[PDB]
């Protein structure tokens, strides 16, 4: 669809470090260049190099090819929120089930929302998944370490954002509604969701889910969506024309002092007047979910595949 701040990365050496950038726009310019999945792959699976070469994040493979929230460059994926500190894409475990559907063959990284959070799978350097995804066989097309972005697969239609934390009573109220709505479900991804005197084995479960910032997610069938825009400082990226993201020192000056160029919308809330320029991020805004008479701004809203267990009694 196009990037937020920075065009696709053109890396030189796989051994080059990952300079961690605190500046928000700088953190999003890494996200545009998949420097975050690059880090995760390194931090969690002996991966030497980067993902996203030439293509960038705008080229990551999404399992639901009909991915709606991907067309919006500014809607954050699970991984993209891992870089900003909203969710940790936990490394997989022998018990974290890989969902069927995605063409895993050749993937270097892939990720899926799980009922209790987010889980990713990495392959080591010069390695790539099998068609089932549970091993990392050899792949001569991965020796470079400067791998394409198609080698990154993000499972599910997912949108992440700053969440209004909800009283825990709400969550439990929501979990109670999710249980009356989904009585057949006994477990989701290994997390108890109801009680059954007879449970069938794990089963693919395409479900609209929601992260309200609590233990598990709130899975949904009858729910309403609606998008907003707070025009807050996190919905605006800052950049120096031609030279990429503005420094952290320049950004705060832009988004506080108001002595910076910018789009209409920035100007109309922050101010304007060689210099730094800030703009809006490409997104409908913040997703608000109506559910069981209550609306909640989720940390992440989305429709994704999960492995769940249904009753037999």
């Amino acid at each position, epitope marked *: 669809t196009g990037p937020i701040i920075c065009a696709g990365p053109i890396h030189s050496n796989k051994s080059a470090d990952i300079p961690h950038l605190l500046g928000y726009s700088e953190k999003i310019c890494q996200i545009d260049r998949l420097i975050h999945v690059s880090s995760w792959l390194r931090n969690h699976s002996q991966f030497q190099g980067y993902v996203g070469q030439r293509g960038g994040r705008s080229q990551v493979s999404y399992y639901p090819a009909e991915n709606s929230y991907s067309r919006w460059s500014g809607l954050l994926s699970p991984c993209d929120a891992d870089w900003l500190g909203m969710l940790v894409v936990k490394k997989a475990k022998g018990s974290d089930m890989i969902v069927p559907g995605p063409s895993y063959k050749g993937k270097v990284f892939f990720e899926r929302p799980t009922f209790d959070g987010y889980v990713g799978w990495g392959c080591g350097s010069g390695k790539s998944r099998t068609e089932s995804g*549970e091993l990392c066989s050899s792949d001569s097309r991965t020796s470079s370490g400067l791998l394409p972005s198609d080698r990154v697969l993000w499972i599910g239609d997912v949108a992440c954002q700053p969440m209004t934390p909800i009283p825990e009573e709400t969550f439990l109220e929501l979990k109670s509604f999710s249980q009356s709505e989904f*009585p057949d479900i006994c477990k989701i991804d290994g997390i108890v969701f109801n009680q059954c005197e*007879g449970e*069938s084995l794990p*089963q*693919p479960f395409d479900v609209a889910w929601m992260d309200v910032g609590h233990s598990h997610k709130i899975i949904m*069938r009858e729910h309403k969506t609606k998008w907003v825009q707070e025009s807050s400082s996190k919905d605006f990226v800052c950049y120096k024309e031609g030279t990429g993201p503005c420094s952290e020192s320049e950004e705060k000056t832009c988004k506080t002092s108001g002595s910076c160029r910018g789009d209409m919308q920035f100007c109309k809330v922050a101010g304007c007047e060689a210099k730094c320029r800030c703009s809006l991020v490409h997104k409908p805004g913040e997703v608000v979910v109506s559910y069981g008479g209550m609306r909640v701004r989720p940390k992440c809203y989305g429709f994704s*595949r999960m492995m769940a267990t249904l009753e*037999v009694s």
Partner: antibody, heavy 116, light 113 residues
């Protein structure tokens, strides 16, 4: 009570087409993956087609891949198997089933006889 | 694909007998999570296939305690501790751990005389 009732079975001509409809009642259709199973006259059961709950994923064995198309409208809580390129080897009682390695609820079946 | 071979194909049975139905798979029906999606179905004449056992040994509810499954790996077995007339029919084993899912050859429980 969990009830699946298939419909659309009858005589078809070789190479012709027939679509089977599975009407689902007594459960939350959209939270179950579903599948179609046939029984040849020699009483052999065969897995025919599978579909996720949201219809996004389908699977077939190469015996009926590209010839059949499974589909489901959760809105009407109905499962569908569009059968094309039919042959006398497609002579069977086609059952629809609540699915994923455990066909825990089956339909009454619908006889599809491919014969010129 | 995963060839499910069912022994016996025909099994003469008398009421009160305990009968065994063995199903041996070409490959290991243990996936990479230890989950084995092998299920046993009963198909009585003129009715629909009914799920008896799923997941090797877990009884579908509505199925009497006389039906029991067991096994691991390649060879799996269905066990009816006490045959009753309502159990006669064709019994099928079925994988689901690997695609394509494959049923077994079938076991006709017929009356021994």
């Amino acid at each position: 009570e969990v009830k699946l009732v298939e419909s659309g079975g009858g005589l078809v001509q070789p190479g012709g087409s027939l679509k089977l409809s599975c009407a689902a009642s007594g459960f939350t259709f959209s939270t179950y993956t579903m599948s179609w199973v046939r029984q040849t006259p020699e009483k052999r059961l065969e897995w025919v087609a599978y579909i996720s709950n949201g219809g996004g994923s389908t699977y077939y064995p190469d015996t009926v891949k590209g010839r059949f198309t499974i589909s489901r409208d959760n809105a009407k809580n109905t499962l569908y198997l569009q059968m094309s390129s039919l042959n006398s080897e497609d002579t069977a009682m086609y059952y629809c089933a609540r699915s994923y390695g455990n066909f825990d609820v089956w339909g009454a079946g619908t006889t599809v006889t491919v014969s010129s | 694909d995963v060839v499910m071979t069912q022994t016996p194909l025909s099994l003469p049975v008398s009421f009160g007998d305990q009968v065994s139905i063995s199903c041996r798979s070409s490959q290991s029906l243990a996936n990479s999570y230890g989950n084995t999606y092998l299920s046993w179905y009963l198909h009585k004449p003129g009715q629909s296939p009914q799920l008896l056992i799923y997941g090797i040994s877990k009884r579908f509810s509505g199925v009497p305690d006389r039906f029991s499954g067991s096994g691991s790996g390649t060879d799996f077995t269905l066990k009816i501790s006490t045959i009753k007339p309502e159990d006669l029919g064709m019994y099928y084993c079925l994988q689901g751990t690997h695609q394509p899912w494959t049923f077994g050859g079938g076991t006709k429980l017929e009356i021994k005389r």
